[PDB]
């Protein structure tokens, strides 16, 4: 059979719990659901080949669910990833989000945390970069980095917490972030292979601190940076002297020996303001 439509048509007539003489005559049910699964997958594939993606993703969803009615949890989630891949590649972020959410539900309940995390991250990423639900992207970037910890795979766990920290700084949870940064610093010196990146944590931690108008903590955290950090100093001052011009300048300068990335620019404007408001206060 080569018509996805037909394949799917049969896929339905078959993936149904049998009863009566049928149940008796015909071998087990799961054998049927698998048979149904295998049908949708065959359709999903023809669709994928044809570049109809949303139809391939929608096809896989069916297959996946058939697969779990057959009790092949792994084969299922694996399939959910396939559906996600399509819905993603097809720009259907909403459905691509669903798809993953199942794979994860499974990978998680099935105890496969390392693989869970892997997708928990992607999920967060789409949640963050596309749908723009930062409040939920943060939740994943956290629960994902958390699993990586147990798996003792530090490296990755950090990649999460930064995506996590950076992003809370925007939503304005200034200290929680400077905290996550603190932790990202402590559990990053035990690895002399991270040394280089450790500057940004400090600076970023200080910037958060200043943004919360806590210039002491910043001054402190700058000192601790003795066991970039030079630009933080010039800011801990421009602030301590309500001069939204020395600051507004040091940033202008620092933008030469290191163009500022969106984050810093956001956070830095939130600081320049906290100064002006204090001048007109």
Curated annotation (Swiss-Prot):
Chief localisation class: membrane
Membrane-topology descriptor: Peripheral membrane protein
Subcellular location: Membrane
Record key words, sorted: Acetylation, ER-Golgi transport, Isopeptide bond, Membrane, Protein transport, Transport, Ubl conjugation
Covalent cross-link (Glycyl lysine isopeptide (Lys-Gly) (interchain with G-Cter in ubiquitin)), residues: 252
Domain of life according to the entry: Eukaryota
InterPro entries: NSF_attach, TPR-like_helical_dom_sf
Residues modified as N-acetylserine: 2
Molecular function as annotated in GO: ATPase activator activity; soluble NSF attachment protein activity; syntaxin binding
GO-annotated biological processes: autophagy; intracellular protein transport; SNARE complex disassembly; vacuole fusion, non-autophagic; vesicle fusion with Golgi apparatus
Transmembrane segments: none
Example of a GO cellular component annotation carried by this entry: cytosol
Assembly: Binds to vacuolar cis-SNARE complexes composed of the v-SNAREs NYV1, VTI1 and YKT6, and the t-SNAREs VAM3 and VAM7. Interacts with SEC18.
Family: Belongs to the SNAP family.
Function: SNARE complex protein that binds to cis-SNARE complexes on membranes and is required for vesicular transport between the endoplasmic reticulum and the Golgi apparatus and for homotypic vacuole fusion. During the priming step of membrane fusion, is released from cis-SNARE complexes by SEC18 to establish a pool of unpaired SNAREs, which are required for interactions in trans during docking and fusion steps. Can displace HOPS from SNARE complexes, which may be a prerequisite for trans-SNARE complex disassembly and subsequent rounds of priming, docking and fusion.
Protein name: Alpha-soluble NSF attachment protein
Organism of origin: Saccharomyces cerevisiae (strain ATCC 204508 / S288c)
């Amino acid at each position: 059979i080569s018509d996805p439509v037909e394949l799917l048509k049969r896929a339905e007539k078959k993936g149904v719990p049998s009863s009566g003489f049928m149940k008796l005559f015909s071998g087990s049910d799961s054998y049927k659901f698998e048979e149904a699964a295998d049908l949708c997958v065959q359709a999903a594939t023809i669709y994928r080949l044809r570049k109809e993606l949303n139809l391939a993703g929608d096809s896989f969803l069916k297959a996946a669910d058939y697969q779990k009615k057959a009790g092949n949890e792994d084969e299922a989630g694996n399939t959910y990833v396939e559906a996600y891949k399509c819905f993603k590649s097809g720009g259907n972020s909403v459905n691509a989000v669903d798809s993953l959410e199942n794979a994860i539900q499974i990978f998680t309940h099935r105890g496969q945390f390392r693989r869970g995390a892997n997708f928990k991250f992607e999920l967060g990423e789409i949640l963050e970069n596309d749908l723009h639900d930062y409040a939920k992207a943060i939740d994943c970037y956290e629960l994902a980095g958390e699993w990586y910890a147990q798996d003792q795979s530090v490296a990755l766990s950090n990649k999460c917490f930064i995506k996590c920290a950076d992003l809370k700084a925007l939503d304005g949870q200034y200290i929680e972030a400077s905290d996550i940064y603190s932790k990202l610093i402590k559990s990053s010196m035990g690895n002399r292979l991270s040394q280089w990146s450790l500057k940004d944590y400090f600076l970023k931690k200080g910037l958060c601190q200043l943004a919360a108008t806590d210039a002491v903590a910043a001054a402190r955290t700058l000192q601790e940076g003795q066991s970039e950090s030079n630009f933080l100093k010039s800011l801990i001052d421009a602030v301590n002297e309500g001069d939204s011009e020395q600051l507004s300048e040091h940033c202008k300068e620092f933008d030469n020996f290191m163009r500022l990335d969106k984050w810093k620019i956001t956070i830095l404007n939130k600081i320049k303001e906290s100064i002006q408001q204090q001048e007109d206060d």
